[PDB]
Structures are given as C-alpha cells and as structure tokens.
Symmetry: D2
Subunit: 297 residues, 4 copies
C-alpha cells in the first residue's frame, strides 16, 4: 500500500568552504554516492548540520540533491524534522515543493513531548504533504523516544508514515517493532549494527559511514536484502572499526574529518558549536581509515 | 562581575486561541514581582521558547522588560540555541531590547564537544555586554557542559558569571563551587533548591515559583541569609508539588496547575506539547490542595 | 577448544515447603531433554543460586548430571562468584560432581577492574579441565567484562570458549565476533535470541525455554542450520512472552508462569525473592494464553 | 530508637601474605578512635567483605569490638547479604559477637522487588535487638531501596533507624527526610558528605576517613553543630581526594593511599580486586600530597 523509500541511504555531510556551502563539492559528493550503488541520499539531516544551516542553504542543498539525482533511480529523502510542529510542517512542505521524494523527520528535541504529543506532532506532519514520511528516533540526541506503540499507531493511522530510522542501540526494540508491525520499514540509524537490524527484517540504512565508503555500505545493505547474510555480516564485521571511530566524537565531526583526510572535501570546516576533533582523535581516524579502500570520484 | 541572582522564575507563556495572551503575560509577571521574586526569565524552556515565533519571542521579552521597569526585578532573557550564530543573534536581541542579562542553554541535539561548547559560549559572551548565565540540562540537550568548561568560561569571559544546573548531580555542584567559589551557581531543579543553596548556590530559576512565588522567594532569601532551618523547611514542604510538577515534561504540569489555580485562562500548549493525561491532570489537582496559592 | 553450545535452559529450582523439590527438578530436566534442548544450566541465576545452601547446590547439579546420563544433553553448571577463591571452589566442585562445563558470572557488587576480571577468570580456568563460559550481565553485577578482556581470556586460557551476553547491546556482540570470530557467543536475553544467533552466535541460555522448550530449541536449531527465516518467526512469536517474563526480576515471572502452567506444584521463592504483584501475576497469565505450553 | 550516627569509617582490611593483618587491623582502628571517629564499620564493602572467609569475618568483628571497649566508639558491623537467611545469620553473628549495630546492604545481583526488600529487611530486623542501618548503593547491587520502602521499614521495625545512601541522588535525600524526618540519613559518598549533612543527615560512613580521619570527623561534627560554613570548607578541601579515592573501584584507591602513607605494610587485595593501574597509582600519590596525613 504505502509509498516507501528504502535500501542503502547516505546521510550527506555538508561541505563548507570559507563559511559557505561548497555547492560543486556537494554535487560532486552526491554523484559519487550514485555511482557506488546508493539507493537514496538524505540532504540537510543531522550529518549535514541542518541545525546550523540557514533557510537558504537548506534549500540549496535539497535542490542540488534533487537535481543531481535526476534521471537515476536514486531518491532524495530530505531532512525536515523540528521540535516545533508548525516548523516541522513548514519544513515538510518545503521539501515537497523543492522536489524531495520523501522526508526524514526527527523526533522533537529538547522540549521532550509526551507520546500523545509525538502522535499529534507527526500526524500534523504526515497530513501536510503527500510524500513518504520516515520517523527518526534518536533519544541520545533528542531527550525523547518515540515508543514502539506510538510508531506503530502512526504507521497505521497516517498514510504517508511508512517506518522509522532507529538510532537507539536497542535491538530489542527493533524486534518489538517488526514482531508487532512487520509491514513497516525499519531503517538502521547506527552503522555498527547495520547487519543485525537488516537480518531481523530491516529494509535499509541511513548511513554515516557511507559518506566515506558508499560501495561497502551499499553492498552490505543489498547483500542483506537479498538474504546473503554471510556476505552482509562479513562487510559489517569489516566495517566495525571505522563504524566506531566515526563516532569517536559527535557525528559529523569524525566523518567530515575522514572525508577531508580522504581528499573528498577541500576544507575541514564546521559550523559552531561543532568544531575540528582533538588532535588525538584526528590521528585515530586517519589510522583507522588506512585499512579501507576509499573510492574516489 | 555583574550578576543576576536570587529567586527567579522561569515564566510560562500563556496562549489564548493559539496566540500569545499578552495581557495575562504581563499580569503574571507582575504577580511575580509582588511576591518577592528577584528576576524573571522570559522565553525559556518553561516558556515554550522552542515553539514561539520571532515576533512572539520579541513580544514576551519586551513585555517582561516593560513590566519590570521601576522595580528591583531583573529580566534574564532566554537566548540559547544549538547554532552559535543563532545564539549570538538571540543574545544581541535581548540586549538591544532592555534585558538585564541572558540565560543561554547548552546546544541541544547536535552534541558539541567541550571545545565546541567553549567556542560557542565565548562567541555569545563577546557579542553583548550584559551578564550571561550558562544553562546545563543534559537530560534535554543530550550534552553536558563539564565542570572544567564552565570554570574556564567563567574565568575567560567577563560576562559569564555562573551556571543554571539542572543535572540532579549535587556532586557536580560541590565540584563547581569548591574549585571556583566565585561563580554564581543557580538551582535549575526545584526539588533540590535548598541543597544547592546550602552548598553556596546564590539563586534559583524556578518552575514552581510560577505557582508559589512567595514560598520560593522566601526559601531562597532564607537560604541566602543562612537561615538554613527555615529554607530547608520550605524546601521539604514544597517537595510534593516540586515532584508532581514534572509528572509530565515541564511545562505541561505547571501550565496545568496555573490553569487549575485560575491564573491563566486556557490550558493551551503549542505542539508537540499538549495537555497532560487525565490521570496526571487529577494528580496535579490533588497535590495542589495542600498548598496556598496566591491570586493576583 | 571444547565447547558447549546450542539451545540451553537456565533451570528454575522448584521449592516445596522451603525445600528443593528434587522430584520436580528431575521431572523438569526430563521435560527439557525431550523437547530438543542441548544443555541445561543448574544452579544459575534463574535457579536462585544466590540463596541455595551448599547441600542444595550439590543436589541440583547431581540431579542434572544424573538425569542427562545416556543423552546428548550437557550439564553447564553455574559456578560464578564475586570472590575468586570461591569461584575456583565452585568450578572444582562442578567438575568433581560430573558437570560437562561451567557458567561463571562476572563478579557482582565488588566491581573489579578489567585486570582483576582477567586474573579472576584465569584462576577459574586453570582450576578445572572442562569448558568455561563467561557470563556478562552488567545490570546485575555492576561490572562489565570488556570485549578486549573477553577476547584476551578466550585466547589465553584453553578452557574459556565464549561468553553469555545479557547486556542489551548488540553492538558489543558485533564487536566480539568481528574481532574474535572463533569464540562462542551465547544469547543471555531471550527477546534478542535471533539477532544474536543471526550475527554468528552459537546458542542461547534461555529463561523462556523453561516454559517453552520446544520453541526455543527449534529457534536455535533453525538459526544454527542457517534457516534464519524460521528462526526469526519463532523469535517474533516469542517476543510477548520473552518480555513479560521480565516484568519483574527473573526468575519471579518464569516461576509464576511455570506454576500457572501446572509444571511446578508451589509458587515458592527463597527470600529476598517473592511472589509477583497481583497485577503482574495477571499480566503473565494473560500473555501465556497465546502460547501452547507442553506438559510432561 | 537506638541509633549509631556521627563520623564513621568503613574500615579497610589489610592483608599480609594473603592473610588478615590482625595487628595492623587493630592499630588502624585505634588510629580512627584517636582522631575523633564515632564508629567503625568492620567487614563492609571497603573491608572487602565479599572475599573474606567466615573465620576472617569473625576475626575482624571481634578485633573491632575488642579495640573499641572502653571508648565512646561503637561498632557497626557489616552484615548484608543477597540471601535473606544468610543476612539473618550475619546479623545474629554480629549481635552475638558484641557489635553495637549492623550495616546491611541491599541484596546484590538477584534484584529483589520492593516487596522482597521489605520482607528481606523485616526478617533481619526481627532476628536481632541492635540497630540496623540500611545501605542503598544501586550502582553496586543492581537494585534500589525505594524511599517508600525505606520509610515503611523505618516505621514498621524498631531496629531499623535509617539508611546509608550511596546513590548520588540528593533529590532522594530530600524525599527521605521531607516525609520521614526522624530517620538517620547517613552519607555513603564522601564527596557529598556536607550536602547530605546540611539537609539533615546525621552522619557519614566514610572511605576517606581511613586516610584522613581527623578531617572527616571535624566535618561531621561541625555540620552536626550547624557550623555549615566550617563543614563546607572541609568538604570543599576534601573534594580532590574524595574523587581520586574512586579513580578505580573502592577500596582499590583507599588501600593504595593507605599503603603510600605507610599506614599498611603491603598493597595486597583479595581477587578479583587487585592493584590499581600505574597511572592511577601515580594520580593517587599526587593528590595525597596536598593533605596532612596523621600517623599512628
Ligand atoms: N537551530 C534550530 C533552528 C534551525 C533549524 N535549522 C536551522 N536552524 C534547530 O536546530 O532546530
Ligand atoms: N525550534 C527551533 C528554532 C526556534 C527557537 N525559537 C523558536 N524557534 C529550536 O528550538 O531551536
Ligand atoms: N549469597 C552469596 C553466597 C552464596 C552463593 N551460593 C549460595 N550462597 C552469593 O550470592 O554470592
Ligand atoms: N562472596 C559471597 C559470599 C560471601 C560473603 N562473605 C564472604 N563470602 C558474597 O559476597 O555474598
Ligand atoms: Mg500498512
Ligand atoms: Mg547467508
Ligand atoms: Mg554521535
Ligand atoms: Mg536559553
Ligand atoms: Mg554463574
Ligand atoms: Mg586442571
Ligand atoms: Mg531480570
Ligand atoms: Mg536475567
Ligand atoms: Mg561499646
Ligand atoms: Mg552490609
Ligand atoms: Mg551526585
Ligand atoms: Mg539525633
Ligand atoms: Mg557542639
């Protein structure tokens, strides 16, 4: 029934050069994702530092993502969450009027809505557009969790809501979700446990690691979707070291560092309050990167 | 250092037909003035800061500033953000609009490092010339301002004069005031108002004081005069309401209580915040019965 | 390495009038063997090991050893303790009384360091010549056996062949098997039996199998045979019972369920364990109605 | 109610060639007596209770009881267990051997329910006629004694006169004394000794007092006399050592410090406890240099 966006997906970093969005590098990075088997890209999400982007930069990165993926099978799942419902509705409509195929909408952060409030929050979002809406649960960042019951109720009550991106380190909850609502699309939000989530019936990943190693995250996901769990687990095991080191500090500090170390972006620039990693963690990321075959452009 | 301390209220923002009830806002703030409160915090967490428009945000700061003119009560305006350039803009805004200082919560959701938190607050502190109070609430932000970072910011930036602590960590409050006794430690958790003050805390930014400003004001001023027996006795008496006011996420219970007390006209929130459950509504009403609530 | 893997049951210890019901104990083990179980764990956490006398500990190990003679079912005896010299004595005891291997939980309460945990288990491993399975359950012990410590112990001590994981941390299970794929990772949490097995885990030590031995043994054997579809569907039906069996601290719900199913005569615990609340008693009864419980 | 309050020391248990140094044990207790300590706690957590033999347990209680005869110092013997019948035996043991009261930690590892904790402690309290102090340390036991359970036990059983809290939860300490101000709240965390005392706590059971008994004793008695300025100044002064004494799991740092101060002859632990890392050894030595350490 439901319109879905699944498979291997990349939470795109937003490269900056002299405090401005590096627009051809942004486009150059997405084409690199397309050519390495990625099924969808997520502009202006957490890994893209949406929280510090201006309104316009937000529009520029969605429009570049939409245009770069034209004429390919690669979908654009635009970041559109906010802790204010009227703001999240505006972001959802914004992503729709600018050509996104669907939206990722993170649970409200900081203001800790109740489960009832989360239901009304997402119901208002789902009714505002006619494109797929993927919930994003990351309690370590938001201070709140969308309960299994709330996710399932939203999936059943609102046409557009087709699943949830899980970044809670709780494989029990992933069993809980798919055992009581097996029709939903559970999406891995934690690279280290990509395979365990997929092997339980998860239908995709929204990846940080795929920024650096899109081919490996792509192959992992597609192996698992084709039920080649031995080959999916083998990439997951090989990726564990980089999957962990990419969170030595808060994402996207390590991944942007690695992208810079790989020569895939020109400057190691963040928007405050994000900043360069410690020099110790800088060295750790560079060291761990050395075992992986990093595709160029 | 210029400071803003004493008994302070995290002001609720009353809504009427989904729009800011400006007259009730002013009436609630003066009600605070008349009950011994030393400072008010407009457009903070308890004020549903996150969901207000730019104009509403301006309207409530301006009302607060205006209502406090001609009194000793200071306006400590909410100005935090998880984007440094946004927080700098909010800081400048509050300054330009007559606020006596700013409360600026640690960046939420994007989890900056300690180094990033330092640069975040340094940029905010250099952007204005009014006192800046840090706000640490890791349960809401996903982030913590370490003791070392707080102390470094206090020592390096003239405007940063202390921290509002909402971490349930009296150990950290000992850590803070034992290594930097000059800072102003402000209670951000009503239930442990007295323990924080008794260790050298110099004020509270209270949720409960919305409902019981006279008791929170007396508690704080007793404690500041080292009348610890009387401060602790008010803290002990207030425990039941202090807990029930977080039966659901603040400000859902306090707005419910303010509505039950007839102090605001509508039990209206801005989504994703909403009315409490029917059971918690009744629990709040039940606990309120043991307290004497001042009218207008 | 000698290993003990597959579908395993953490045996409850039935009491009658404050005494170990030896007949029931043998009959329950009898029942597990007949439903495809590969090994039984006497005198573990689910068996209320902490409150058994020396005599009772001995009794239940010997009954387990006796009941599994002439079958393929191994006896993996509980032998952990937070005192190394006591754990060595328990390990030697289990070997002297016919156990095929030992489960040895990480020291509880005294929170040893990783270095101490390494020395603790090396002393245990050198004390016997039978396989040793580590048991990590930080929610109960207050300590964690780190991945590095587990891997070092697996490589440095012949008898140590894997770890029972009860940490709600599938990341650690990836960590373990990605860096030491030769070890035997055993599920200690029934609800996530399949995810652990599907990542290369080689068995479960189950609470649910006390009640539903046929379903837990089929799940494990399906997964071990790389029939992950059939393993996952049994894991999915078992979720409701897997969760309700921990509505209160194990083994309070499983003994309640065993009593409700008529598999044990009395709902008796040894203090400080006790009957569940009346609400949770009814909840366990309600969840059981969807399942087909095998009798004797 | 009969109570045991004031400044109290959780005694380390010195070992020499794997055996309890009985002479050193007595000499250490006499040092505590001579430095203002009001009570000593033999065979507790800091004394490595979990790894002592029956004989050693009794030897250390008898040495403590004998050494404190003719002094104002009471013996609050460790007597907790996670098995109620074992804890009852330990309670009767301490009473029959001259202890003035017992400390009884919440059952560890097996996670009893609040109902089970109530029945656990009621049986212990009925078994003896000397004061019983509860010990809540959820980070070690995996369980918490709720405020309601503590208050119920205090009200229903004569011997239960308070609780030793090691939960880093000053909110709970407000909760306890706001609803039951007659109980004796005892600090189980040295860093927050003063905040607990200034809220109405009536004593400490201290790790730091092993090394600095005069300073912990002065802190407590200043606080008990409502000299909070002087009590807080010692608490602030002690923060660095109070923190470093848990760089690793207690009693690893305190025994290291006692050995570095020449107060015990060998840095020996019973496994799974062990010497600290070389880094933390040096850190402990560094922080110790800022303090005046009394000899014998
Ligand atoms: N910084 C605010 C507002 C914002 C969103 N995107 C850009 N700015 C937030 O994270 O919600
Ligand atoms: N909702 C966003 C932006 C905002 C602040 N105030 C109003 N809107 C935040 O909480 O940061
Ligand atoms: N109750 C103690 C001692 C014991 C073990 N088995 C029986 N008693 C423990 O759990 O370690
Ligand atoms: N080690 C077990 C048994 C014991 C207690 N005291 C000495 N041994 C426990 O801590 O409960
Ligand atoms: Mg459907
Ligand atoms: Mg396969
Ligand atoms: Mg992160
Ligand atoms: Mg703020
Ligand atoms: Mg064991
Ligand atoms: Mg041998
Ligand atoms: Mg349990
Ligand atoms: Mg268990
Ligand atoms: Mg005496
Ligand atoms: Mg004890
Ligand atoms: Mg604390
Ligand atoms: Mg008294
Ligand atoms: Mg006096």
């Amino acid at each position: 029934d439901k319109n879905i966006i699944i498979g291997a997906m990349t939470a795109l970093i937003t490269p900056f050069k002299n405090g401005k969005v590096d627009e051809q590098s942004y486009a150059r990075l997405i084409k690199r994702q397309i050519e390495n088997g990625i099924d969808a890209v997520v502009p202006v999400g957490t890994t893209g530092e949406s929280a510090t982007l201006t309104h316009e930069e937000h529009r520029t990165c969605i429009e570049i993502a939409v245009e770069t993926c034209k004429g390919t099978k690669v979908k654009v799942l635009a970041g559109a969450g906010s802790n204010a419902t009227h703001e999240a509705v505006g972001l959802a409509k914004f992503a729709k009027e600018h050509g996104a195929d669907g939206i990722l909408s993170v649970a409200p952060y900081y203001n800790k809505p109740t489960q009832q409030g989360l239901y009304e929050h997402y119901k208002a979002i789902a009714q505002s557009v006619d494109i797929p809406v993927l919930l994003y649960n990351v309690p370590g960042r938001t201070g709140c969790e969308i309960s299994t019951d709330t996710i399932i109720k939203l999936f059943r009550d609102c046409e557009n809501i087709y699943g949830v991106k899980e970044a809670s380190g709780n494989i029990d909850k992933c069993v809980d979700l798919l055992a009581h609502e097996p029709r939903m699309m559970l999406i891995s939000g934690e690279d280290a446990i990509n395979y365990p989530i997929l092997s339980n019936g998860g239908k995709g990943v929204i990846s940080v690691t795929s920024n650096l190693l899109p081919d490996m995250i792509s192959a992992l996901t597609h192996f698992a979707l084709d039920e080649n769990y031995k080959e999916a687990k083998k990439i997951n095991d090989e990726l564990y070291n980089i999957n962990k080191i990419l969170f030595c500090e808060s994402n996207p500090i390590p991944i942007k560092t690695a992208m810079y170390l790989a020569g895939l972006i020109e400057s190691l620039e963040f928007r405050l309050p994000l900043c360069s990693p410690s020099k110790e963690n800088f060295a750790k990321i560079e060291e761990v990167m050395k075992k992986y075959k990093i595709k160029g452009f």
